[PDB]
Amino acid sequence: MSFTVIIPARFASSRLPGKPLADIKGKPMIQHVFEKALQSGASRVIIATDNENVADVAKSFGAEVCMTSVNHNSGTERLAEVVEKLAIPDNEIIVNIQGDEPLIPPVIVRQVADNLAKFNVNMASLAVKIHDAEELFNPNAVKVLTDKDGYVLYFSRSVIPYDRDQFMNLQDVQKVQLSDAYLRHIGIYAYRAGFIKQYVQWAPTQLENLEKLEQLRVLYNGERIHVELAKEVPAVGVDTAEDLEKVRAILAAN
Amino acid sequence: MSFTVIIPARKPMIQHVFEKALQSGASRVIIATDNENVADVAKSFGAEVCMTSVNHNSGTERLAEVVEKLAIPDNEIIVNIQGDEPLIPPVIVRQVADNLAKFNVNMASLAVKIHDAEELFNPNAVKVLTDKDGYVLYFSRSVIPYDRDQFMNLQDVQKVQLSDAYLRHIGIYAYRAGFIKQYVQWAPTQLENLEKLEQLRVLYNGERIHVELAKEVPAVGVDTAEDLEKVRAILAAN
Numbered sequence: 001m002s003f004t005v006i007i008p009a010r011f012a013s014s015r016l017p018g019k020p021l022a023d024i025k026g027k028p029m030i031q032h033v034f035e036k037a038l039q040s041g042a043s044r045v046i047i048a049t050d051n052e053n054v055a056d057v058a059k060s061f062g063a064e065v066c067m068t069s070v071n072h073n074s075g076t077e078r079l080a081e082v083v084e085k086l087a088i089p090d091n092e093i094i095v096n097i098q099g100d101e102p103l104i105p106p107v108i109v110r111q112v113a114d115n116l117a118k119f120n121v122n123m124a125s126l127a128v129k130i131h132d133a134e135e136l137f138n139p140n141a142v143k144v145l146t147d148k149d150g151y152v153l154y155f156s157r158s159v160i161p162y163d164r165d166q167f168m169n170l171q172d173v174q175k176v177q178l179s180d181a182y183l184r185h186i187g188i189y190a191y192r193a194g195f196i197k198q199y200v201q202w203a204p205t206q207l208e209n210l211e212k213l214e215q216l217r218v219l220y221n222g223e224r225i226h227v228e229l230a231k232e233v234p235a236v237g238v239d240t241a242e243d244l245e246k247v248r249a250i251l252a253a254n
Numbered sequence: 255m256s257f258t259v260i261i262p263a264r265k266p267m268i269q270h271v272f273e274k275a276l277q278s279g280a281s282r283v284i285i286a287t288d289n290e291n292v293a294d295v296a297k298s299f300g301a302e303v304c305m306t307s308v309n310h311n312s313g314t315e316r317l318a319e320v321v322e323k324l325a326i327p328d329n330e331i332i333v334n335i336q337g338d339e340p341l342i343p344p345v346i347v348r349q350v351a352d353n354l355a356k357f358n359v360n361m362a363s364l365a366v367k368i369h370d371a372e373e374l375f376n377p378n379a380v381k382v383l384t385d386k387d388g389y390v391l392y393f394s395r396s397v398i399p400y401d402r403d404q405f406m407n408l409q410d411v412q413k414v415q416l417s418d419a420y421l422r423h424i425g426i427y428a429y430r431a432g433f434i435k436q437y438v439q440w441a442p443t444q445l446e447n448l449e450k451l452e453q454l455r456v457l458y459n460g461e462r463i464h465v466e467l468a469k470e471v472p473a474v475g476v477d478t479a480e481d482l483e484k485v486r487a488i489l490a491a492n
């Protein structure tokens with residue numbers, strides 16, 4: 001049950017400059033994720049970053065921070081260094097709440113950490129349903145599909161599953177009514193310190209570089225992943241300035 | 255090794271498929287069809303025919319009735335060669351049959367590398383990708399894997415570099431008669447209903463599928479001297 005949260009907060013970002021420090025109602029984005037993790041019930045909350053400026057701000061708001069190499073290509077790779085640096089036991093459960101999920105409800109953090117034992121996987125994540133076609137067709141929205149038991153089939157930026165009879169000869173994209181079969185992946189993962197170590201022992205894959213999805217290294221290497229549907233999202237992932245206005249809107253509506 | 259080919263149908267491609275199933279080493283070759291005419295034409299070139307119900311939404315479902323009518327043992331390996339695959343040699347057909355035990359799976363299939371970018375966006379070309387060992391991750395009419403950098407507003411399919419990251423699924427499956435009976439025992443899935451891909455029912459039910467990457471070879475064993483004389487014979491009578 002017990003677990004520790006590590007929040008990867010890379011500074012550089014093509015889409016959103018200074019992303020982690022992006023302002024949201026008076027506080028940088030990372031602070032929201034942080035204060036959220038505090039109420040999750042985690043035993044320790046660590047902001048993993050690669051920028052001195054981000055480190056200062058994170059310290060200014062009382063967050064323990066671990067500096068990491070700017071050479072990492074993903075949060076999972078970054079957390080591999082934190083786990084080693086801070087000698088966190090292999091059996092310790094780590095929940096990676098990516099620094100761009102400022103609205104993730106605290107209750108689901110505990111849920112994902114528990115899903116490792118419940119579903120017998122070395123890695124577990126979450127997802128919310130997609131209701132609008134615009135979001136489904138958005139490459140920034142990562143889609144995921146599982147089998148009857150929740151075990152992931154594939155993660156992709158591509159439109160899956162493909163609705164052949166509705167999409168092939170689609171006359172008007174606005175007249176699109178999705179069927180209840182789409183899931184947007186939340187940028188949150190649960191995995192033991194030891195599994196993270198195994199992750200970086202595996203070699204980078206072409207698959208993860210094509211899609212730009214760190215979790216594909218896991219599927220590529222025959223490792224099972226469980227994803228569970230959460231209810232009441234309300235917002236997921238901020239990669240663009242627009243998603244940023246999406247979060248401000250969902251908050252303005254107190 | 256020792257498998258029987260069952261062809262769900264519904265010079266003709268029907269015959270060209272029969273002769274490939276024969277040169278594949280199969281012990282028995284059955285032509286499953288729900289049409290009297292087709293069944294009639296299959297008895298023309300000496301093919302075993304098994305009339306099946308029209309109430310089958312997929313070749314795999316049609317094969318279930320066959321396995322029932324012919325009382326084929328559950329452990330008997332059946333190779334479903336959906337239709338014609340001119341660039342697919344018969345030696346590969348046996349390998350897919352042997353892959354069931356090799357990779358320890360109940361369903362085995364194959365795929366070819368995509369060389370034309372237009373295929374990726376052709377909904378009628380089914381794309382597939384596997385893990386490092388060949389176990390399928392997903393099948394889709396949508397392009398997968400998705401190349402973020404290149405597809406970000408691609409205004410010309412001709413600029414797409416394939417990097418050998420893409421595979422086209424070929425409609426040929428290997429699976430024991432017992433597994434086929436299992437297939438039709440599982441309820442139809444939302445997944446297969448949307449994508450219109452029968453194999454998705456297997457994935458959704460937590461089963462693994464192994465796919466082999468095959469090399470496209472020129473039409474091998476398309477006709478025999480005899481078949482060609484007959485063709486010329488028809489033409490000459492004019």
Ligand SMILES: O=C(O)[C@@]1(O)C[C@@H](O)[C@@H](O)[C@@H]([C@H](O)CO)O1
Nearest residue numbers: 100142185186187212213214237
């Ligand atoms: O927002 C992200 O940084 C990212 O896109 C990184 C990816 O590797 C992947 O983890 C993704 C999640 O699938 C959530 O979209 O988040």
Ligand SMILES: O=C(O)[C@]1(O)C[C@@H](O)[C@@H](O)[C@@H]([C@H](O)CO)O1
Nearest residue numbers: 336380423424425450451452453
């Ligand atoms: O639609 C197809 O392509 C079909 O003939 C039936 C599908 O269920 C599926 O088996 C498909 C194969 O994936 C080959 O494309 O063949």
